[PDB]
């Protein structure tokens, strides 16, 4: 999930946009 | 500002700024 991709590892714009509506 | 470790409220703030009017879903699991 988002925590594993962006908090425990370094986030990215691609990863954040995966969760936009 | 997005290419770093973003945790807790900082991650939710990043989603808010990036997604804008699209909104977002936050599922920490």
Coordinates of N, CA and C in Angstrom, one line a residue:
Chain A
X1 N 0.8 -1.2 0.0 CA 0.0 0.0 0.0 C 0.8 1.3 0.0
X2 N 0.2 2.4 0.2 CA 0.8 3.7 0.1 C 1.9 3.9 1.2
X3 N 1.7 3.3 2.4 CA 2.7 3.5 3.4 C 4.0 2.8 3.1
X4 N 3.9 1.6 2.6 CA 5.1 0.8 2.2 C 5.8 1.5 1.0
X5 N 5.1 2.1 0.1 CA 5.7 2.7 -1.0 C 6.2 4.2 -0.8
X6 N 5.7 4.9 0.2 CA 5.9 6.3 0.3 C 6.5 6.7 1.7
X7 N 6.2 5.9 2.7 CA 6.7 6.2 4.0 C 7.9 5.3 4.4
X8 N 7.8 4.0 4.3 CA 9.0 3.2 4.6 C 10.0 3.1 3.5
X9 N 9.6 3.5 2.2 CA 10.5 3.7 1.1 C 10.2 5.1 0.6
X10 N 11.0 5.5 -0.4 CA 10.9 6.9 -0.9 C 9.8 7.0 -1.9
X11 N 8.9 8.0 -1.7 CA 7.7 8.2 -2.5 C 8.1 8.7 -3.9
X12 N 7.1 8.8 -4.7 CA 7.3 9.3 -6.1 C 5.9 9.9 -6.5
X13 N 6.0 10.8 -7.5 CA 4.8 11.4 -8.0 C 3.9 10.4 -8.6
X14 N 4.4 9.4 -9.3 CA 3.6 8.3 -9.9 C 2.9 7.6 -8.8
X15 N 3.6 7.3 -7.7 CA 2.9 6.5 -6.7 C 1.8 7.3 -6.0
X16 N 2.0 8.6 -5.8 CA 0.9 9.4 -5.2 C -0.3 9.5 -6.1
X17 N 0.0 9.7 -7.4 CA -1.2 9.8 -8.3 C -1.9 8.6 -8.5
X18 N -1.4 7.4 -8.1 CA -2.1 6.2 -8.1 C -3.3 6.2 -7.2
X19 N -3.3 7.1 -6.2 CA -4.3 7.2 -5.2 C -5.2 8.4 -5.4
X20 N -5.1 9.2 -6.4 CA -6.0 10.3 -6.7 C -7.3 9.7 -7.2
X21 N -8.4 10.5 -7.1 CA -9.7 10.0 -7.5 C -9.9 10.4 -9.0
Chain B
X1 N 8.8 18.1 -3.9 CA 8.6 17.7 -2.5 C 8.1 16.3 -2.3
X2 N 7.9 15.6 -3.4 CA 7.3 14.3 -3.4 C 8.3 13.2 -3.3
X3 N 9.6 13.4 -3.7 CA 10.6 12.4 -3.7 C 11.4 12.3 -2.4
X4 N 10.7 11.9 -1.4 CA 11.2 11.7 0.0 C 10.3 10.7 0.7
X5 N 10.8 10.4 1.9 CA 9.9 9.6 2.8 C 8.8 10.5 3.4
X6 N 7.6 10.1 3.1 CA 6.4 10.9 3.5 C 5.6 10.0 4.4
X7 N 5.4 10.4 5.7 CA 4.8 9.6 6.7 C 3.7 10.3 7.4
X8 N 2.6 9.6 7.8 CA 1.6 10.2 8.6 C 0.9 11.4 7.9
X9 N 0.8 12.5 8.7 CA 0.1 13.6 8.1 C 0.8 14.2 6.9
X10 N 2.2 14.0 6.9 CA 2.9 14.6 5.7 C 2.5 13.9 4.4
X11 N 2.2 12.6 4.5 CA 1.8 11.8 3.3 C 0.4 12.3 2.9
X12 N -0.5 12.5 3.9 CA -1.8 12.9 3.5 C -1.8 14.4 2.9
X13 N -0.9 15.2 3.4 CA -0.7 16.5 2.9 C -0.2 16.5 1.5
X14 N 0.7 15.6 1.2 CA 1.2 15.4 -0.2 C 0.1 15.0 -1.2
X15 N -0.7 14.0 -0.7 CA -1.9 13.6 -1.6 C -2.8 14.8 -1.8
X16 N -3.1 15.6 -0.8 CA -4.0 16.7 -0.9 C -3.4 17.7 -1.9
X17 N -2.1 18.0 -1.9 CA -1.6 19.0 -2.8 C -1.5 18.4 -4.2
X18 N -1.1 17.2 -4.4 CA -0.9 16.6 -5.7 C -2.2 16.4 -6.4
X19 N -3.2 15.8 -5.6 CA -4.4 15.4 -6.3 C -5.4 16.5 -6.5
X20 N -5.4 17.6 -5.7 CA -6.2 18.7 -5.9 C -7.7 18.3 -6.0
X21 N -8.4 18.8 -7.0 CA -9.8 18.6 -7.1 C -10.2 17.2 -7.4
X22 N -9.2 16.3 -7.8 CA -9.5 14.9 -8.1 C -9.8 14.2 -6.8
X23 N -9.3 14.7 -5.6 CA -9.5 14.0 -4.4 C -8.5 12.8 -4.4
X24 N -8.6 12.0 -3.3 CA -7.7 10.9 -3.1 C -8.3 10.0 -2.1
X25 N -7.8 8.7 -2.1 CA -8.1 7.8 -1.0 C -6.8 7.4 -0.3
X26 N -6.9 7.5 1.1 CA -5.7 7.2 1.9 C -6.0 5.9 2.7
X27 N -5.3 4.8 2.3 CA -5.5 3.5 2.9 C -4.2 3.0 3.5
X28 N -3.9 3.3 4.7 CA -2.6 2.9 5.3 C -2.5 1.4 5.5
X29 N -3.6 0.7 5.5 CA -3.7 -0.8 5.8 C -3.3 -1.1 7.2

